[PDB]
Amino acid sequence: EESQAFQRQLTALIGYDVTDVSNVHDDELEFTRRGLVTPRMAEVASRDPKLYAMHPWVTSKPLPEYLWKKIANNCIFIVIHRSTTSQTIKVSPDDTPGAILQSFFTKMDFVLRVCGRDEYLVGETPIKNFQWVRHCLKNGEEIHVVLDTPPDPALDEVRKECDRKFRVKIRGIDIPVLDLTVFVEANIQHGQQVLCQRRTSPKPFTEEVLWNVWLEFSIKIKDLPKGALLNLQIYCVQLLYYVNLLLIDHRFLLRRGEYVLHMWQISSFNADKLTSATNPDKENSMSISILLDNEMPNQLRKQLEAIIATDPLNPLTAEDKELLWHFRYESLKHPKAYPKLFSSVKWGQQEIVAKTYQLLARREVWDQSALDVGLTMQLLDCNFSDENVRAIAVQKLESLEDDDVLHYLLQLVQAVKFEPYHDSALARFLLKRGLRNKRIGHFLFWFLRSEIAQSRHYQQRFAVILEAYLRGCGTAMLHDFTQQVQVIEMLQKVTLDIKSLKYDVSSQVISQLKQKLENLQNSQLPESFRVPYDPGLKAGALAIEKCKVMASKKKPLWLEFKCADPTALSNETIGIIFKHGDDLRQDMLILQILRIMESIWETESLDLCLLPYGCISTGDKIGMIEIVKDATTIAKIQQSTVGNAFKDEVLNHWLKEKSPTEEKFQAAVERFVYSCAGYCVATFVLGIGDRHNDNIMITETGNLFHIDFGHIKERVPFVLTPDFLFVMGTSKTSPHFQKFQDICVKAYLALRHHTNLLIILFSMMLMTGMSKEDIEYIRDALTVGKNEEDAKKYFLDQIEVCRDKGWTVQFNWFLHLVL
Numbered sequence: 001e002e003s004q005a006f007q008r009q010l011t012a013l014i015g016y017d018v019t020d021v022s023n024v025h026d027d028e029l030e031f032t033r034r035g036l037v038t039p040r041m042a043e044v045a046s047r048d049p050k051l052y053a054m055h056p057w058v059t060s061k062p063l064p065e066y067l068w069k070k071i072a073n074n075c076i077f078i079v080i081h082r083s084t085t086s087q088t089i090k091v092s093p094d095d096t097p098g099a100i101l102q103s104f105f106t107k108m109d110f111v112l113r114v115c116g117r118d119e120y121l122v123g124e125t126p127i128k129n130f131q132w133v134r135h136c137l138k139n140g141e142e143i144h145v146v147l148d149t150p151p152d153p154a155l156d157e158v159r160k161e162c163d164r165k166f167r168v169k170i171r172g173i174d175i176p177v178l179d180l181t182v183f184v185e186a187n188i189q190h191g192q193q194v195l196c197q198r199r200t201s202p203k204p205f206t207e208e209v210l211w212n213v214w215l216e217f218s219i220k221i222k223d224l225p226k227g228a229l230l231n232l233q234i235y236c237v238q239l240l241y242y243v244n245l246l247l248i249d250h251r252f253l254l255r256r257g258e259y260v261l262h263m264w265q266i267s268s269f270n271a272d273k274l275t276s277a278t279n280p281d282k283e284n285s286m287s288i289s290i291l292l293d294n295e296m297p298n299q300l301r302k303q304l305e306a307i308i309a310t311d312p313l314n315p316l317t318a319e320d321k322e323l324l325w326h327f328r329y330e331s332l333k334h335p336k337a338y339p340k341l342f343s344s345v346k347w348g349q350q351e352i353v354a355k356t357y358q359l360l361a362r363r364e365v366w367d368q369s370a371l372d373v374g375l376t377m378q379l380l381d382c383n384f385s386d387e388n389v390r391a392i393a394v395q396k397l398e399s400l401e402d403d404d405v406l407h408y409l410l411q412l413v414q415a416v417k418f419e420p421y422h423d424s425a426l427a428r429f430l431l432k433r434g435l436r437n438k439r440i441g442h443f444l445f446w447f448l449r450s451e452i453a454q455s456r457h458y459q460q461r462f463a464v465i466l467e468a469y470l471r472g473c474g475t476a477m478l479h480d481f482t483q484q485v486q487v488i489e490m491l492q493k494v495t496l497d498i499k500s501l502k503y504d505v506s507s508q509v510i511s512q513l514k515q516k517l518e519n520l521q522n523s524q525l526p527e528s529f530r531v532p533y534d535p536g537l538k539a540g541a542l543a544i545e546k547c548k549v550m551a552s553k554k555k556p557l558w559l560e561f562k563c564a565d566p567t568a569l570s571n572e573t574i575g576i577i578f579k580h581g582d583d584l585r586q587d588m589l590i591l592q593i594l595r596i597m598e599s600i601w602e603t604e605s606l607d608l609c610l611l612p613y614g615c616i617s618t619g620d621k622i623g624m625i626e627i628v629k630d631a632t633t634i635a636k637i638q639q640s641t642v643g644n645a646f647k648d649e650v651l652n653h654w655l656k657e658k659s660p661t662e663e664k665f666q667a668a669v670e671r672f673v674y675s676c677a678g679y680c681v682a683t684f685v686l687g688i689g690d691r692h693n694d695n696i697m698i699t700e701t702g703n704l705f706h707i708d709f710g711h712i713k714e715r716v717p718f719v720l721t722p723d724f725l726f727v728m729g730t731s732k733t734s735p736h737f738q739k740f741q742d743i744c745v746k747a748y749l750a751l752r753h754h755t756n757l758l759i760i761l762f763s764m765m766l767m768t769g770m771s772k773e774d775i776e777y778i779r780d781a782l783t784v785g786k787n788e789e790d791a792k793k794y795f796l797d798q799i800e801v802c803r804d805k806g807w808t809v810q811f812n813w814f815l816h817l818v819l
C-alpha cells in the first residue's frame with residue numbers, strides 16, 4: 001500500500017508508468033529494472049554523506065590566464081556575512097575553505113554557503129578551483145558568502161527496498177485504416193551495416209495482406225552476433241513502416257516464437273529507426289506477424305597512417321577495411337584507429353568476432369592513453385552495436401571529473417538511443433554519476449524527462465533509467481523534483497491557454513493572464529522551487545506585475561520570480577520564458593555544444609563572452625528559456641530609430657545611450673568585439689550562421705548573443721553586418737576590426753584542434769535531435785585536410801563575404817518575414 005503509493009509518485013515524477021506491460025513482447029525492461037538495483041545501491045552506499053549533501057562544484061583545470069590577469073598581489077578578497085555583520089578577508093588563491101574558516105575564527109563547525117544560492121564552498125580544494133569563484137572573477141564581481149550550518153545528510157534518506165541458416169516467417173501485415181502494391185523487406189542489421197537482406201513478393205495493399213513465406217537468410221545461426229537486429233520494413237517505391245527485433249536477447253538466448261509487432265510510421269538516418277520499442281498505438285498503427293523457430297612495408301604503413309589520420313566522416317573502402325584488419329595488431333597501437341578498425345570487422349562471421357574479442361584482450365595501449373572524448377564518443381554512436389567495443393569507451397569515461405561529465409551529459413544521455421540493450425555500461429555510468437553528485441543528478445533528471453515526454457521510441461528505456469536514479473537520489477531531492485514538476489505542469493497549462501486566446505496582444509488577453517497567475521499563487525503553487533536550468537537558485541513568488549505575454553508569433557509567457565533566499569545580495573528577479581511552438585531540444589543541443597566550445601577556448605586562454613542561456617525542453621515543442629537581463633533584439637534597435645531599410649549608426653548609438661560612463665562604453669565595445677567574434681565562429685562551424693537579426697540579441701553591456709536555434713538565394717556565412725562594423729569603427733579597417741579578425745582566426749584555429757570531437761557531436765546531434773550531406777557540411781566548415789595558414793585565410797575570406805553582402809541578406813529576411 002505504501003510501496004504502491006511510492007510508485008505513483010515516481011510515475012508522476014517520471015511522466016511514464018514503468019510497471020506498464022501493455023507495450024512489451026518480452027521482459028527486457030523488467031530485467032533492467034531488476035538489473036539496476038545493485039548499481040544504484042552501490043553508489044548510494046559509497047557516496048560521502050556530507051559532500052553529497054553540499055555538492056561542491058569544483059574543477060581540477062588550471063585557472064586560465066585571463067582570470068589570473070584579473071587578480072593582483074596574489075590576493076583574492078572574500079566577504080563573509082552572518083546575521084547583520086560582514087567582513088572582507090584577504091585570501092591566497094591556494095587556500096582551502098577549511099583554512100579560510102580558521103582565519104574567520106582567529107580574527108573574530110560552520111560552512112561557507114554562497115549568498116542567495118544553494119551553493120557551498122567545502123572540501124579539500126583550493127578556492128581558485130571552485131566554479132562560483134571562477135564565475136565571480138570572470139564578471140568582475142565580489143565573492144559574497146554566508147557563514148552557516150551544513151545541511152543535514154539525513155535529508156538525503158533513501159527508502160529501504162548449430163550450422164543451419166537463419167530464417168523468418170512473414171505471416172502478414174495489417175492496418176486498421178489505409179490501389180497500390182506493397183512488400184515487406186527483412187534485414188539482419190548490426191551497427192547500421194546490413195549483413196543480409198530478403199524480400200517478400202509484392203502484393204496488393206489492402207487492410208490485411210498475408211504471405212505465409214519463410215524468408216531464408218544467407219547468414220547462419222552461429223554467425224549471428226550479440227546486438228544483431230531483425231529490421232522489418234514496409235515499402236509500397238517508398239518506405240512507410242518499420243520495426244525492429246533483437247535476434248539475441250538480454251539472456252543471450254536466440255529469439256523464438258510468434259510475434260505481432262506494431263510498427264512505426266515514416267514522416268536519411270535517425271536514431272528512432274534503431275529502436276527496439278514497438279508502437280504503443282495498437283488502435284491506429286500498422287502491425288506485422290512473424291514466426292521464429294530455429295613487419296609491414298613502408299608504402300602500406302603510409303597507406304595505413306593516412307587512413308587512421310582521416311576524419312570520422314571519411315568512409316572506408318573494402319580495400320581500406322581489409323588493410324586495417326590484416327594489420328590489426330599494428331592498428332591496436334593507435335587509439336585514434338579503434339573506430340575505423342572496429343568498423344573493419346565482419347560482425348556476421350563468428351570466428352572473426354572471436355578474434356576481435358581476443359584483440360580487445362590486448363588493450364594495454366588503449367587503457368594507458370589519455371582520455372579523448374571525441375574518440376570515446378565515436379565508439380558510442382550508431383556505428384557500433386557490440387557491447388564489448390562500446391564498454392571500452394565507457395571505461396574511458398570513468399575517469400572524467402563531475403565538471404567534465406556535465407559538459408557532455410546531454411549527448412551522453414542522447415547516446416543511450418544508440419545502445420542495443422536497455423541495460424548497458426553507458427546507462428549504468430549515467431546512473432552512477434548522477435547518484436554520486438547532485439548537480440549531475442539534477443540535469444540527468446531533466447534530460448531523461450525531456451525524452452520521456454516526447455519520444456515514444458525511447459521513453460520506455462529512458463523511464464527505466466530515470467526510476468533507477470530517483471530511487472537513490474534521496475528524499476530531499478525527490479521533494480525538490482516534485483516541487484519543480486508541479487510548477488512547470490501548472491505554467492505549461494497557462495502557456496497553452498493564453499496561446500489559444502492577429503499577432504496583437506489584446507487588452508482582454510493581458511487581463512486573463514494576470515487572472516490565471518493570481519489564482520495559482522493562492523492555490524497550489526509551492527512557495528518556492530529550484531530553477532530547472534540553474535539548480536542553485538530557488539524561485540519564490542510570481543512577480544505578477546512584471547509578467548506579460550510577448551507580442552511574438554507563438555505568444556510566449558514572460559515570467560518573473562522573487563528569489564526565495566533572503567540572503568540574496570540583490571533584489572533581482574528570476575526571469576523565465578515559457579514557450580510553445582519552438583523545438584527546444586534543438587536549442588538544448590546547440591547550447592551544449594556552445595559550452596563545449598567555450599571550454600575549448602579556455603584551454604588556449606580565450607574568453608569569447610558567449611551567453612549560452614539556460615534552456616530546458618519539457619515536452620513536444622514546449623519548455624522554458626532563461627531570460628538574459630537587460631537584453632534587446634538587434635531588429636528592435638533598428639525598429640525604434642528607422643521603423644521598417646537599415647542604418648549603420650544605430651547600434652553604436654544604442655550602446656552609447658545605454659552607457660553611463662565612457663569607461664563602461666569602452667568595456668561594452670570590447671565585449672561586443674569578443675562576443676560577436678565568438679558567435680561568428682560558433683555559428684559558422686555549426687551551419688547556423690545565416691540568421692535574421694530578430695534572432696540576435698545584445699545586452700546593455702555589449703554582450704551579443706544568438707537565440708531560438710530550432711529548425712536550421714543569397715547566403716551569408718555569419719551575421720557581420722554594417723551596424724556591427726560601425727561599433728568596431730569601420731565602414732577600410734580599424735584597431736577594433738583588427739582585434740576582431742585576430743580573435744576570429746585564433747578561435748577558428750582553436751576549434752580545429754578539436755575537429756574530430758566537433759564532427760562527432762554535430763553528427764550525433766543531427767541523428768538524435770533534428771542525410772549524410774548535412775553532416776558533411778561541418779568538414780568543409782572546419783577545413784579538414786588544410787594546413788593552418790591556408791585555414792586562417794579561409795575564415796578571413798568568410799569575413800570579407802559578409803562585408804561584400806552588407807545588408808542584402810538581412811533585407812531579404814525582412815521581406816521573407818513579410819511573406
Ligand SMILES: Cc1nc(N)nc(-c2c(Nc3ccn[nH]3)nc3ccccn23)n1
Pocket residue numbers: 550552556577582587613625626627628629631632707708709
Ligand atoms: C535568452 C533570451 N533572453 C531574452 N531576454 N529573450 C529571449 C527571447 C527568446 N529566446 C528564445 C530562445 C529560444 N526561443 N526563443 N525568444 C523571445 C521572444 C520574444 C522576446 C524575447 N525572447 N531569450
